[model samples]
Target: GAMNSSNYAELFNNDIKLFVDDTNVYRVTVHKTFEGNVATKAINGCIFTLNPKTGHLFLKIIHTSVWAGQKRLSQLAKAKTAEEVSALVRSLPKEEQPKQIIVTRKAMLDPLEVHMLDFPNIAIRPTELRLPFSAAMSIDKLSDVVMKATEPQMVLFNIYDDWLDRISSYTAFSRLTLLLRALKTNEESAKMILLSDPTITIKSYHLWPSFTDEQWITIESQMRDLILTEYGRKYNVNISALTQTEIKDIILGQ
Candidate 1:
């Protein structure tokens, strides 16, 4: 995190995605899981890391770069939603916008949500994406979710206007986002969603949606490796004891 500067770092850098007002720039992400700090006020953006002061897991928003935000707040010349603090607090929800998600990401616009629709198949958020384990472990949960998604819905999310950094130690929070993107199909020109992969996703930002079982095998293999070799070492767990199939199954929801 200390390595992040006005230019480059492996992760964690302040880039604006949304501006509520002159003094109000916000970096927002739908959590992969329940960290539940709600909204906070901060001088920066948020992602995954730790705090030098509070010493907790947090994403710090340092200042740099000026990519435009996707969810416009109605510009003063073009965006601003608040007549006062209360009105500012009650701006219309993101769910009010439908076509914005895929459209914004396709153009590389930063979003008020997850995560700004990354990868080839630019996305907004159905926000099903949080996971402590692989989607395999939660197939029924996913089945219920997708089955229930009868509408192409929108969601307006609230973020910290003050100094707030969301805390996370989980890379899956971000990676699962890519996975979900692989699963989202445009109902309008729908494609077969069950056989999606990153290769296809990266092929065209507008096409592939949904992943194949084989793709799950390959993707989760990498995830489990990170989980075992990276996270498992923390508890001194012998991650090596697990076989290749055993590791992959957890990711695949065997």
Candidate 2:
């Protein structure tokens, strides 16, 4: 009687509690039919966990048939490792493999990084505008008119040097002023030309650190004046006459 009571006490401790005739009972039972169905389904199929947050799914292969299918696919793709299955491609001759898979370097600066760098602001406009001086003209014309009159190398060097210096500590306004000064010369016409329905705007300059609307206006105005004055002197023609507007109006057009 003591041995039976000890066994019952152990059973009660480990067994599941269930309701029987409105009274609780601790019991252990094996439902063979339910277990058989679960085993059969697991053998026939796979289960996957869906992540609701990221809409990503995690698959767990339970069936031999599913495993075999996956194995065949891996063999076709020449995948030696599970990681390669998604990215690898197969060779025509199942056994022979390609020497190497060429992955072209898709190296591009991140959009945010580019924006931070003020790349959009400093970008060159299209070279479709008609100018009196052409750098690609005859050797004599290029040397005599373009090179001699406007020292392109010196101008570029000045711009580069100033950019390097001002970019570190100067505010956007200060930098813009410096840039405008570097670009300004008595020998050439080089200004920011606003086109109709321009994809990029002067406002884009604000993407750079510490740039302001006033600074942008000052830079644009300075560039306009420099270009007009230089071109007028070089061509022996007034910008007002060519554009049919006042010098100030040409510089700050409505």
Candidate 3:
């Protein structure tokens, strides 16, 4: 069966395997799952086959310092399309040229339904806030009232870009997940957030590390209040009965 680009992420998520063809050409098979976003689509489920003779080239690409070799494998994973794989091989310098290439296709399944009890029934439009990045949420209707309302202050002061970027790739529940983790002294939670996301590396560069603790406190406190003001009434939870941290946990989709 033919493999769709959408499934590559799942393959990678599951595992990458090594095998030999009937002719014994050593090859690598990896998988991926699609996220429906442009970036995610490009690398999902595509496969590559190497010529038996040039199998040593695969070795060359994969053989290096422990970290370098690991990164090369990661780079290989990202090379989802046949052309990209060809380019990668062709780009090899010093006795590497005109090498041939081959590639794969795979299975499909209905993506599972995502449910989070404490997650907000809200949509965050950052383009509305002049930021980059997008997320597909599991909700029906989209709302921009809160982001629109806060946009003015966000830009007028010009200090929150890093924070904005930090939350840009999150769903509402994970957004709260991040805040609670950051505010509640749970480094592991923050670590998990980074571990769970592939795109976090670039997004993390914007963090304004030099900002004073007071500045961070101000921003975090305001964000909590903002979430309550925007989502509290609709969910009908007793805001006064719980502390902000507890409310955040209740609001978190754990």
**lDDT of every predicted structure (CA atoms):** 0.28, 0.26, 0.28
lDDT of 3 by residue, 79-181 (tens): 3232233344335562443211112111001100011112132111111111101110100011121112321111111112344333331222234333433
Relative to the unseen true structure, what is the C-alpha lDDT of residue 29 in candidate 2, on a scale of 0 to 100? 28
Name the lDDT value of residue 25 in candidate 3. Answer: 12
The full ranking of all candidates by lDDT, starting with the best, is 1, 3, 2
Error of 1 at 191 (Å): 26
TM-score of model number 2: 0.20
**lDDT (0-100) at residue 4 of candidate 3?**
23
Instruction: Flag the better candidate by lDDT, 1 or 2.
Output: 1
Which structure is stronger by TM-score: 1 or 2? 1
Model 2 agreement with the true structure over 1-254: per-residue lDDT tens digits: 11121122221221211100100001122345644642221122112121111212222222233234344532322121122211121212333222211111111112212222322222111111111111112212212322233211111012112233334322322333223332334223332332222343433222122323465465555655666766577878866566533442222111
lDDT of 1: 0.28
TM-scores vs. true structure, each candidate: 0.24, 0.20, 0.24
